Design a binder for this molecule. Structure first.
Ligand SMILES: [Cu+2]
Ligand SMILES: [Cu+2]
Ligand SMILES: [Zn+2]
Ligand SMILES: [Zn+2]
Lengths: 168, 166
């Protein structure tokens, strides 16, 4: 009703080397009301199956600009000028098992509405684990040392269908 | 403050093997929240015969590429008006030798406000928009512009693309 829905078709970065994995999938967002915390769904494939598991970071980056693949999306979206991992799109780490990632998350800080909306911004999936600001360099407090940008998408307005169908 | 947006046009995920593969960029610039929108279109990949052709580009309701361009919904119509008065009804563009290149000023779409096209879809079609003059119901809903070939989700971007791509 006042519920907001968004979607993001994660696709490999245009700038990848042949050696890098090619990650594809979907991120869905659902926010029951403007003041509500964000719910999300993440389902990705294309990670290496050996090693059989890994931890990978996903965040929101400032610009839905895929002109240089994921590189052109800019830094973590940071409308309140705070350190990582206080950015609204700091979604954290996700467990990859046998090449796949499948996870719902709730209580996210980001919004689909208002001045700090992530609609039209980028979701970026990284090669590495987010150290959550606990590493011993400046990068830790910018991006969590999450490493190379594997795959990304622009967050789009969508209907309720995708979320309803996925939930079943 | 000026707003800029970009849309990285790519072939639909759901094309068959015999359809053309159209790629390129649409850039947007809005000087103030209630200014008319300026847009730049630069695409390639159209069939090179017929050497000349006219092809429609529109904004569709949903930035949803789950089914490629098919899942982007109908034309975005926040102000409840018939085709071709939708804000993202960009009209027909001259394609010559596979390519399309055009600047349009003073479009009645917005990057700001409740009716923003940010996060919606730009869709490039195989045919020409009949601009509401086709003589049937579809004509005043979508202009009978044929199949959806290529699309993208409109993204917030910095000033750089607009300065360089012109
Ligand atoms: Cu990131
Ligand atoms: Cu269209
Ligand atoms: Zn961050
Ligand atoms: Zn229309």
């Amino acid at each position: 009703d006042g519920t907001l829905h968004a979607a993001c078709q994660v696709q490999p970065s245009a700038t990848l080397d042949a050696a890098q994995p090619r990650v594809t999938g979907v991120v869905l967002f659902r926010q029951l009301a403007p003041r509500a915390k964000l719910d999300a769904f993440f389902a990705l494939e294309g990670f290496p199956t050996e090693p059989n598991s890994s931890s990978r970071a996903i965040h929101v980056h400032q610009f839905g600009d895929l002109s240089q693949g994921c590189e052109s999306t800019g830094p973590h979206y940071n409308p309140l000028a705070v350190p990582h991992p206080q950015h609204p799109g700091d979604f954290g780490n996700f467990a990859v098992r046998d090449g796949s990632l499948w996870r719902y998350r709730a209580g996210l800080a980001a919004s689909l509405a208002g001045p700090h909306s992530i609609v039209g911004r980028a979701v970026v999936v990284h090669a590495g684990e987010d150290d959550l600001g606990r590493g011993g360099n400046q990068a830790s407090v910018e991006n969590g040392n999450a490493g190379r940008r594997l795959a990304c998408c622009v967050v789009g307005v969508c209907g309720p269908g995708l979320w309803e169908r996925q939930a079943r």
